[PDB]
């Protein structure tokens, strides 16, 4: 019983994909099988933006954003609810 056309990963034209480390557990999963999100998160949340912009020394300053690109494996993704088991039909769309 085959569950996915691409196998769960998107490798076509290759035979080998260099692997990466899960950010949670450090399981080794190939780069193009790993649930990759690029999250860009403010240093603070919106209860802590004015209390730092009324304490920034120089007026007109803008907060940075944590740009980082986290990698996860399938186990840590399912466990963290980054992704969910979708129905047989709904499983097929990519948006």
């Amino acid at each position: 019983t085959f569950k996915r056309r691409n196998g769960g990963r998107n490798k076509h034209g290759r035979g080998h994909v260099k692997y990466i480390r899960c950010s949670n557990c450090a399981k080794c999963c190939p780069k193009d099988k790993a649930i990759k999100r690029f999250l860009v998160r403010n240093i603070v949340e919106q209860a802590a933006v004015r209390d730092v912009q009324e304490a920034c020394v120089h007026d007109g300053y803008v907060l940075p954003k944590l740009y980082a690109k986290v990698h996860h494996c399938v186990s840590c993704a399912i466990h963290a609810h980054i992704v969910r088991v979708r129905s047989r039909e709904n499983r097929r769309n990519r948006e």
Partner: protein, 211 residues
């Protein structure tokens, strides 16, 4: 415990807009642990935004060396530059390409250093192609062009004027108007200047760049 530490006045060379970058502190001069030459090489990391009182340049962290101290006032000469971490990550996104280069340059006062330059390709407006990639040969042509341009830009009289070029992004705005015939190259910069081997002391030479 902190009653034996006295502050000093950190001030930057005269090629900068504003000076008096900050205050540091040393243990007062004993013998053997004399304070003056005891440290001698504090490397400070002052952003170019509050050395030129601007905010378009909240990137470009300029890194300064202390090279000699003068009576409760420590002199300083330029040492390097780099992006603040946050800038460069915001510069790199999917569906484009990143181009980088590096080159040793030796300037007229015998200063060896390294230039790391970076660029990214544009989307020309009306583009419906979802990506803007080069073809890995245009990449190498423009990397060669970047190295050639930067060598020709540099090899000039000193770091004095060489930072008079670093400040207004001379290398940047003069890269594309030489290499856009191959790609647009938006957000060309010089991500880093790493001073490799500082030559000597030259009391006399410090004191015109810094006053």
């Amino acid at each position: 415990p902190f009653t034996k530490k006295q502050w000093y006045d950190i001030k930057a060379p005269l090629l900068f807009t504003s000076r008096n970058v900050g205050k540091t502190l040393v243990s007062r001069t004993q013998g053997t642990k004399i304070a003056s030459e005891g440290l001698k090489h504090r490397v400070f990391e002052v952003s170019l935004a509050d050395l030129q009182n601007d905010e378009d340049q909240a990137y470009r962290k300029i890194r300064l060396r202390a090279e000699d101290v003068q009576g409760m006032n420590v002199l300083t000469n330029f040492w390097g530059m780099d992006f603040t971490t946050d800038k460069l990550r915001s510069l790199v996104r999917k569906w484009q390409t990143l181009i980088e280069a590096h080159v040793d340059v030796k300037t007229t006062d015998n200063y060896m250093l390294r230039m790391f330059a970076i660029g990214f390709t544009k989307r020309r407006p009306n583009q419906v192609k979802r990506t803007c990639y080069a073809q890995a040969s245009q990449i190498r042509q423009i990397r060669r062009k970047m190295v050639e341009i930067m060598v020709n830009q540099a090899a000039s009289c000193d770091l004095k004027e060489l930072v008079n070029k670093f400040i207004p992004e001379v290398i940047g705005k003069e890269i594309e108007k030489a290499t856009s015939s191959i790609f647009p190259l938006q957000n060309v910069y010089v991500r880093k200047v790493k001073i490799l081997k500082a030559p000597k002391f030259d009391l006399g030479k410090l004191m015109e760049v810094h006053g």
